[PDB]
């Protein structure tokens, strides 16, 4: 996260860390959506142009964390994965369309003051909250600047940007399955997600029922916090049918 601030303890109990077994390192962010399911970005696991192709046995999911590098004894829970599901139509060759994946934990994790699932939006919540000008919140242990790492989880609040503005800021072909967020060069405020943050949640707090809903997944951007450029996020509601299908069938 660039230009954000340290998160308060228990501020994002659904934040998950994707951790590589060997060499032990942070791979990406993720989110807990139930006691046995984690949501993340597909490119965190599969991206052939960089010869990236991780399987269930290659990584661990760390939940309830705050500090990026410390093993938070009695606080965090480390889980093994049983199965990874990548969207059948994830487009890694062109624009990262449908950058989403589900991971099934080997065993359910117990909830606590630091571990709690986030809600998935329903059509009404999405239609009501996904509007230009409305702010969402992004969290992660990613890079603090394009070109180091934070000591604890970072957080930044960013406004959703009009689709035309998003499209006119890049050469990449943008689809209905993504939305972009960030401040405009003239708004006098900055902030963006960055490498290491992908897979993490973009959440919003509903003013109707006071619940936090994950509207997006950190997907991509060109650089980090560059003026005139915006962060792009996978549209979670747009892909909910596939999410429910995987959970129900498997």
């Amino acid at each position: 996260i660039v230009e954000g601030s340290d998160a308060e303890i228990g501020m994002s109990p659904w934040q998950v860390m994707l951790f590589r077994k060997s060499p032990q390192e942070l791979l990406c962010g993720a989110s807990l959506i139930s006691d046995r399911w984690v949501l993340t970005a597909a490119h965190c696991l599969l991206y052939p142009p960089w010869d990236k192709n991780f399987t269930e046995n290659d990584l661990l999911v760390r939940i309830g964390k705050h500090s990026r590098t410390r093993y938070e004894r009695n606080i965090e829970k480390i889980s093994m994965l049983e199965k990874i599901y990548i969207h059948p139509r994830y487009n890694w060759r062109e624009n990262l369309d449908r950058d989403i994946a589900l991971m099934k934990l080997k065993k359910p994790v117990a909830f606590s003051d630091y571990i709690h699932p986030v809600c998935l939006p329903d059509r009404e919540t999405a239609a009501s909250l996904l509007q230009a000008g409305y702010k969402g919140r992004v969290t992660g242990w990613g890079n603090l600047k394009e070109t180091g790492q934070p000591s604890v989880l970072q957080v930044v609040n960013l406004p959703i940007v009009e689709r035309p503005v998003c499209k006119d800021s890049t050469r990449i072909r943008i689809t209905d399955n993504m939305f972009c967020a960030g401040y405009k060069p003239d708004e006098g405020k900055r902030g963006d997600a960055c490498e290491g943050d992908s897979g993490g949640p973009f959440v919003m707090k509903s003013p109707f029922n006071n619940r936090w809903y994950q509207m997006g997944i950190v997907s991509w951007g060109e650089g980090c916090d560059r003026d005139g450029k915006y962060g792009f996020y996978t549209h979670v509601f747009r892909l909910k049918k596939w999410i429910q299908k995987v959970i129900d069938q498997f």
Partner: peptide, 28 residues
């Protein structure tokens, strides 16, 4: 989940975090 999105240390205790007011204030 039944109590999804409600944080033990915040919503469940009726305590707000440092910047959530920023989000709510943007929802016209």
């Amino acid at each position: 989940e039944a109590d999804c999105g409600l944080r033990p240390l915040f919503e469940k205790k009726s305590l707000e975090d440092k910047t959530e007011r920023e989000l709510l204030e943007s929802y016209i």
